[PDB]
Amino acid sequence: REDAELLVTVRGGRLRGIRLKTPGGPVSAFLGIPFAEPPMGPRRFLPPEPKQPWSGVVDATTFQSVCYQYVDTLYPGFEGTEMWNPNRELSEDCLYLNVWTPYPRPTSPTPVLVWIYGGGFYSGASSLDVYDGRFLVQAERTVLVSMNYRVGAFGFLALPGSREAPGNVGLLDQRLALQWVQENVAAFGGDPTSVTLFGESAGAASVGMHLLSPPSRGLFHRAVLQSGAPNGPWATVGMGEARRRATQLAHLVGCPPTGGNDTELVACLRTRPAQVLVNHEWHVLPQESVFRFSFVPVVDGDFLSDTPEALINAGDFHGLQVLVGVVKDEGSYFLVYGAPGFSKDNESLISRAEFLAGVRVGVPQVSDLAAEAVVLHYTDWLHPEDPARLREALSDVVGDHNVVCPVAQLAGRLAAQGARVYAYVFEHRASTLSWPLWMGVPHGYEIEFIFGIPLDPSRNYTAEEKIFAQRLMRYWANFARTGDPNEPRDPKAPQWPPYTAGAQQYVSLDLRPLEVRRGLRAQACAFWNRFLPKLLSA
Amino acid sequence: EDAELLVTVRGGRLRGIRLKTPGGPVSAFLGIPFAEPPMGPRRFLPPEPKQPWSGVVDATTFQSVCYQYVDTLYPGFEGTEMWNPNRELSEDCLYLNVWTPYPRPTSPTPVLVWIYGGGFYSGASSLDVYDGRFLVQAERTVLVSMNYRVGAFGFLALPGSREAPGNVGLLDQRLALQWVQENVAAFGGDPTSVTLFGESAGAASVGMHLLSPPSRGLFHRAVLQSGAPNGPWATVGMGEARRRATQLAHLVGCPPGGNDTELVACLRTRPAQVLVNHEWHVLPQESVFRFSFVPVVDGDFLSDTPEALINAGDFHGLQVLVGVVKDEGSYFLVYGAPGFSKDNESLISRAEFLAGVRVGVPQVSDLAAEAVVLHYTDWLHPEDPARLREALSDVVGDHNVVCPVAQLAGRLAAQGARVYAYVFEHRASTLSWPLWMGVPHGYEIEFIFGIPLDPSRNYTAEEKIFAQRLMRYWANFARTGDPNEPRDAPQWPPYTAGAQQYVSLDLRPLEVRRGLRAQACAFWNRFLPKLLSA
Ligand SMILES: *[C@@H]1O[C@H](CO)[C@@H](O)[C@H](O)[C@H]1NC(C)=O
């Protein structure tokens, strides 16, 4: 008949879940819960509408479809890229979320972790194997929630001002899911008064944008930003550049029969097959680049009343705890996607000329003067032409500019203006990593340890990596529970101190115990965060 | 009667003097007139050759010091007084000095020609620290040094005017170099082997003779100590030179109008001391390491900026010796940087550091200043007083000396010259400046001249041996274009734009290092010009 633990009533109606085996014991999963009406046809580009209630029992027993998105084909069959590609069918009918909870259901309200995946706002899915929430829930006995949100043009094409494609609807998808958590998580044993958002890359930037948008800020209590920030040069776009990209995309697919009435242009875009839009998505970028994505949140005064830097600088953050961090080699992954001389399949020992050309690819759309300032800071003038050093320096350019320095600026401003901040650098290169050795610890490869994937018996992680994963999961849930990653009552472990704008302390996460260090690439980030903006104004 | 001390030059006959050194005697001829006195109507004009005289010129004592400002910041302090005039001031100052071995050489001897520094506003060949007797005895060279006009008298310029054309102090030096060509053989010197050496504004002067074709035939090698003609202080454009000349006229009660002739005529009626009293006030702002009347780029002595001439030059066949002291900037900080004094530790605050950056890098945009602060801040310790003191010393020294010298060395090397570079890292046991100043600007000179060998001074035995080493390097270079002694040393390798090798000079054996502040000088030499022009 029925298992009462696998049956739950939410405001929309009744749900049936599944019981998941894990190495440490059973977990209840409710996968594929509809939280919005499907944004098909006339609802493409529009804000999400809440799911209408249903009679009977919805089977929330497997992940639903991946939101329509480009699929990477740079290295076909390569494990390092395929792990990020969709593992369900692509559909515009994709607005579903997932809830994992302990089995049996918690007796008293349990803190909630809400995951927001990355993928540059053009890709990603909550169903990816590396986001499997069963291990976190089993190890640390929280409730975990993840949602799908529209990406690409479907989530972020913006004709600012228009009613028909206002932009930012993917962020509205995320907000609706968070509202769902407030109204419904108690039914699963979750505590709506203790919700911790966490996300990586574009998911981290999304987390930050919810920090900076007052209507979202009521829906959670803490935040974890892994390898991303809302103030990154890739994470937002201005109203005019968003309109330009939307209009060129419409133009490239025949709309209209180049601007005109916004209503007629969007109506024509709605008649195009989803895959047709995806096929032209990368062609609207203003130049060849890496770490730039066509359709991203737009600063239009609505979701974001100002740029994220301005909101960060002007914000009062007392009563907030954040945990932020980066991996050791943020920049390496992206270089093989356009930097001249780079391949995962050789050592990418570039020339000086290839370094100079790469600077313009990795810092697109800046003046020649600005590019020269980059070359000045990242050249070692005792060894200006050494290939190994140039390869490392271009990786630093791309990673500092897009991840480390935006994270460091956010960390410093939030700490100075009232928040308790904890910062990390993730320094372990997984035994199973398929990218070449020169890429180091690439962007995105801490996620599997945070989610406890090494505990999966069918995988081949070493034993101390399982210990490491257990330690990280324990750092993440303590912060979720207490706003403090340190273990409630001890002076045994070397202790993780808060990050402040003065001492700038952070810890290294790897197989050895915590080591405290100073400065999130402070000399470099002073260039990106303090000087370079003065140069672009003048 | 001592025939060794009697010489006939083209203008007439001279009587010299025998001097003692710890190694034996030398012959000195001091106060030889090489130009007509540039007095009255000749103020501001190019020098005229000295007309012949009858009788015997008394050349046994130094002549007058050219009119100049006298430092009064620390009255009676040895560290400033050793640079102040030690003879009476006069516009009748164009004399030069020759030291030769005793008895005079009877075989052509290589010649060293010393051009003193002093910001183009001060200096004298008669200063104790330039005493040429020890080099000549120990290394058996002929040594010549001249007085040249400084301040407004040597470099006031109304460009285009015939009454104050500018650069006449540089022409005083050229005239003395022509005098050497015509007369040095009468002393035993070889006019075909003349090495110019100078320090600070003297080194900038050496460099300008390198880049001016009428001077290039007057010497064969060059030594540039802590200075370069491409310094931001060593030259001035025509427009700013004219502005400074006209503000001096106004400050001393002269016209305009307007008309250059009437302006200069009125300036010529003013006592020399009056011009000196207003010299500092024609500068456009509060500053350190800036001087009012310096060489002017007007297309004549210099047909282009020294930067341009250095980049466009064919320097095959040139040998140069260049170098810097370990702490070029420290001395200058006590003359205007907020919070600095020789009498305390000068542990400044961030606010003083930021104000000091506009004093030490004057007349640049706010954006340029911000880039300086970016590069010279340690952003892990942005507020640490000791690090701020050191950093502002580095700003002043890099901008004014180290990076102009590094640029000269790299361009000359890459365009055919053989370059030797050094950093002088010995703090004199006798130094009277505070310890935080390190090895300041100018404090290698006394070692090059072998002053430590003077038994009435307090130098250590190891310091005397060190002076003897340096005198040997300098004279080896004058003789052969190569400072190295026969392999024992380690060897002193040439400086190249790629390897950037130089040696450290101190009590320990030579140690070869790479890069003359390469990271800081990429900022000053490569990036900052792009920023200022865009
Ligand atoms: C074109 O846009 C206007 C509003 O801008 C709208 O009212 C009108 O209905 C649109 N055209 C058609 C044919 O509907």
Ligand SMILES: *[P@@](C)(=O)O[C@H]1CCCC1(C)C
């Ligand atoms: P300048 C750059 O000419 O240096 C002088 C300042 C006063 C004493 C000197 C000769 C070292």
Ligand SMILES: C[P@@H](=O)O[C@H]1CCCC1(C)C
């Ligand atoms: C910066 P984010 O969008 O980076 C994405 C790209 C694929 C893997 C990933 C790290 C989740």
